[PDB]
Design a binder for this molecule. Structure first.
Ligand SMILES: Nc1nc2c(ncn2[C@@H]2O[C@@H]3COP(=O)(O)O[C@H]4[C@@H](O)[C@H](n5cnc6c(=O)[nH]c(N)nc65)O[C@@H]4COP(=O)(O)O[C@H]3[C@H]2O)c(=O)[nH]1
Length: 164
């Protein structure tokens, strides 16, 4: 009821619920709250070449990479869509959120080289960040991360785009 059966991380309604509570918390603490939107690149073509089982295995590997780079108590990793992953980085500023994203992006790119069975694969990442002086809302925070994820898919996949 709270985890994704395939990947084992949180599911959508758990992400939305935890983000609402982590939102009001950051409003009081004044600590930066960052979001990551992680979509798999050329996934439809991936399932066409290697099949639906390899795509599921590629999602679990992507989930393992994110959770390997997201480890603190106030962090959450969830399956936000059939091919997306959303992570909460509470008390993390924009600079540190980018370093996490680069680690995740680089690790997914090298998953084919390190393990023979894996097929080449990349991810696109969008980042948004609330700071203590910002006036945006929670819906605007989520909007800026999906938009930056969209800008990552547009300007050529396999990259990290920070919202503005
Ligand atoms: N929310 C979240 N953010 C993350 C995580 N991993 C990295 N970051 C962000 O990435 C920045 C770079 O961390 P680093 O290069 O691993 O370099 C880190 C790391 O090597 C070390 N460090 C800090 N906390 C821990 C810890 O709990 N365990 C270990 N082993 N090392 C730590 O201190 C350095 C300074 O880190 P910061 O100044 O905090 O800045 C960190 C942090 O803002 C994570 O699992 N969750």
């Amino acid at each position: 009821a709270a985890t994704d059966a395939l990947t084992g991380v949180a599911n959508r309604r758990m992400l939305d619920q935890s983000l609402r509570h982590e939102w009001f918390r950051a409003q009081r603490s004044g600590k930066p709250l960052s979001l990551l939107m992680i979509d798999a690149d050329h996934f439809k073509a991936f399932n066409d070449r290697h099949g639906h089982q390899a795509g599921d295995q590629a999602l679990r590997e992507l989930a393992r990479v994110i959770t390997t780079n997201v480890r603190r108590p106030a962090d959450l990793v969830a399956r936000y869509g059939g091919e997306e992953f959303s992570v909460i980085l509470a008390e993390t500023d924009s600079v540190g959120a980018q370093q996490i994203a680069e680690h995740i992006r680089a690790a997914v790119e090298q998953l084919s080289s390190v393990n023979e069975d894996q097929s080449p694969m990349t991810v696109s990442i969008g980042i948004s960040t609330w700071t203590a002086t910002s006036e945006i809302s929670l819906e605007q925070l989520l909007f800026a991360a999906d938009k930056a994820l969209y800008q990552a898919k547009e300007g050529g996949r396999n990259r990290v785009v920070v919202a503005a």
